[PDB]
Homo-oligomer: 319 residues x 3
């Protein structure tokens, strides 16, 4: 199959980045929904590397207020190794989460094989809090801080993160869907001059202009791999309610599909994260099914499924 | 009343273009909602040509996988005759469906009186499958194939369709709202070079640019008649749930009203189809009422009802 | 605090401008939701002038079809005096309604201190019916007609309104969100040549272009105080269902936040009305809260709360 439709699926059943149980069932519910089968139906070369075990770390005291540092640290270190293995096999790494702290490992591992990569971060949250700016202490709101080169000297020695080396510069990341940012995070976002399209920008410009600007900002100088880190809470909770930190006034089902359709069209998608699907956080069994279906739809669009339609290079009027 | 406000209403209680029962009740639920009365309230000259009787064809064997060919063929043939009669009487034909296979008859009947007409097709689906590309065999998903001049020779001899003559060229149709297109249909669109605004285009451009481009593509050379074929599943199932083939991520209530408001403003609406309203597919009685109300609102906008407001040519302050 | 964040709160528990009971509980439910506390949390200087006592007028006969004229007349006369007092104290007047007839008093009282003010009217309705064009006889659908200078000679001697002097010209008002306009109102709108962005315009242009044009139309010549009169039914009933006259196809939660965010950014907000919140019209206990939370969110955006985030002028990376 073509490069843009060759896929290495990694299940990352991990939850200790945040306090709500159930996010570790994300790989299980996404698979049961028939993700692998639906991708193979759209001419994809899919290989399943299974679910990473993430063996228990019973002795994992907090670093100041930062909860489960060694667990989050080790899960991300093993994900890095697995993502790098998938990348070396000439496959787009498809990380099924799991909480967004796993992005430390996903982007790090991807950058080991492709150091020139650019990040598109779809989320309601910046996840750029450092272990010292965080007020919650939940590492799922800190991944970007461990990855940025400009934040070196501002990240303290956190147990389980000594393997981490900042791999991305402030200029190679674009945020889309922002609407819930902490004071410390907003300060980081402005002082470093990170490119962002909050909900305000999406409202002002329209998702067409947002995507046109996002892709020109990151690819204008030179074509390079794209790493899309998709947090389902980035979409409005009317489409993805079964998630840990939902915020009203989010990206629509259409905007979510438009972002992913545009990234596919570049033929440069190299890494993908489908994060924060928590099937225990539905209010009804339908809310869970609605979130999973939306997450599956976003994923299919990342690998070629277009609303206008798709067809094989054959004559349909004379079979 | 003005030409843009003179209507000939045709009831088309037909369902055999698809397998789900209840879509034949569409003319009944749209009328009960007070469509005729509400149109007369907005200074429309309304003439009701009634509901067409669709006689049973008991031995209507399938053409390959294509279900009920003679039934779908005869219903359209009847609709074509009625639409032409309405058009000759200087009226805008308002077809109350019924499934989308009735578009074969609606557009054919309209083209007999106005051959230079342009088609605006609002829908989640292209309905351009031919009897040979179709996988479902449901005729409601093949009306455009029978109408296109470029597909002459690609349509086999289907029982009940020998009266059909392709009346529209690939350059005379614009699609709005596409989000569920079959491989064969996508091939047809691309090879014939049909103009389309799928949900991707609506997201990219905005409905303002979509309409500006749709109307310029069609009338740019000179003014010509407009046939709007409105399938309620073109709109999102949060506004029109009571329909046979609903697809998520659809046109909003606002986008639907914006398309119809822009078409009204041209004063060139000559034919209208309000299709696929199925009152048996509402999960609650409210889902049915919501779909009917949305369909009625779309129809009123086609004949002048504007969100900014409307007023009679009199002095309201004196 | 900053002028744009120095606020004076006025409670206006009044309902006799329409026939549905409960809209007088609007100030009570908005306060209970913690509006004052949330504003002080975003560095606002908040002063509460309390709830205006609206004494009963037992012998209130209708003027033709116009219901409760003296009651509506006296309530706005009382509000005008209070708004003017708040304005003289160098504060942004924040009127918590209450039905939209109170806009007669809110805009009048504001114009006594700032006569060059511009009005942004966020609503589904024009509220421009005169006491003679109205078919309902409900004064909350008439405040604009009492305020316009061009409609002087067309407003009859209505009991309780002799204190009223038209303070705004047709060129000084912009409508946003219109979708339910009476024939008489549409005639007034067109004959006077009032600037408006009905839902048709919002769909055509996008809220970005709508706001850019609204602010340019009013502030292009000279900076002037902005009076935002926000009726919650201007937003779609999926966000504000607990309201008297809901109309489908309204402004989204995002569009509402975008309008208010843009008005804040000018630093020229001088008067604000949060009207038609009726907690008795919520089909479930959930519908009231949704409407209330939405109204509180709109208000916070008017005084600085931004979706991209906010931060204090301190170095967060080096405390
Ligand atoms: N910035 C947060 C954090 O934990 O740092 C604050 C938060 C808790 C209270 N208000 C929202 C959650 C947010 C982190 C979001 C992490 B996510 O992976 O879902 O983007
Ligand atoms: N192209 C379809 C067909 O029946 O040909 C296939 C369909 C069934 C399963 N996938 C979508 C329905 C579609 C026909 C749509 C007809 B309609 O009037 O609703 O637009
Ligand atoms: N123009 C109205 C009026 O009473 O003037 C007519 C109305 C009643 C039935 N149809 C809509 C209500 C509208 C006025 C609404 C007042 B409001 O402040 O909520 O806009
Ligand atoms: Mn996240
Ligand atoms: Mn998030
Ligand atoms: Mn159709
Ligand atoms: Mn359809
Ligand atoms: Mn109002
Ligand atoms: Mn209103």
């Amino acid at each position: 199959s073509a490069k843009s439709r060759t896929i290495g699926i990694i299940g990352a059943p991990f939850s200790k980045g945040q306090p709500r149980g159930g996010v570790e069932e994300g790989p299980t519910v996404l698979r049961k929904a028939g993700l692998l089968e639906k991708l193979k139906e759209q001419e994809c070369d899919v290989k399943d590397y299974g679910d990473l075990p993430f063996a228990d770390i019973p002795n994992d005291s907090p670093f100041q207020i930062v909860k489960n540092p060694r667990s989050v640290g080790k899960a991300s270190e093993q994900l890095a190794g697995k993502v790098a293995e998938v990348k070396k096999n000439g496959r787009i790494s498809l990380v099924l989460g799991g909480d967004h702290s796993l992005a430390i490992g996903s982007i790090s591992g991807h950058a080991r094989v492709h150091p020139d990569l650019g990040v598109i971060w779809v989320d309601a949250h910046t996840d750029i809090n450092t272990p010292l700016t965080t007020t919650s202490g939940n590492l799922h709101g800190q991944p970007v801080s461990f990855l940025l080169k400009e934040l070196k000297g501002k990240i303290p020695d956190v147990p389980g993160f000594s393997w981490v080396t900042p791999c991305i510069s402030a200029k190679d990341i674009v945020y889309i869907g922002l609407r819930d940012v902490d004071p410390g995070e907003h300060y980081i976002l402005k002082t470093l001059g990170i490119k962002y399209f909050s909900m305000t920008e999406v409202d002002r410009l329209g998702i067409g202009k947002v995507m046109e600007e996002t892709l020109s900002y990151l690819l204008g100088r030179k074509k390079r791999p794209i790493h899309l880190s998709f947090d389902v809470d980035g979409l409005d909770p009317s489409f993805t309610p079964a998630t840990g930190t939902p915020v009203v006034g989010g990206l629509t089902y259409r905007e979510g599909l438009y972002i992913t359709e545009e990234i596919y069209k570049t033929g440069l998608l190299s890494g993908l994260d489908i994060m924060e699907v928590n099937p225990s956080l539905g209010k009804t069994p339908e809310e869970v099914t609605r979130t999973v279906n939306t997450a599956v739809a976003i994923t299919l669009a990342c690998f070629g499924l277009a609303r206008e339609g798709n067809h094989k290079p054959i004559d349909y009027l004379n079979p």
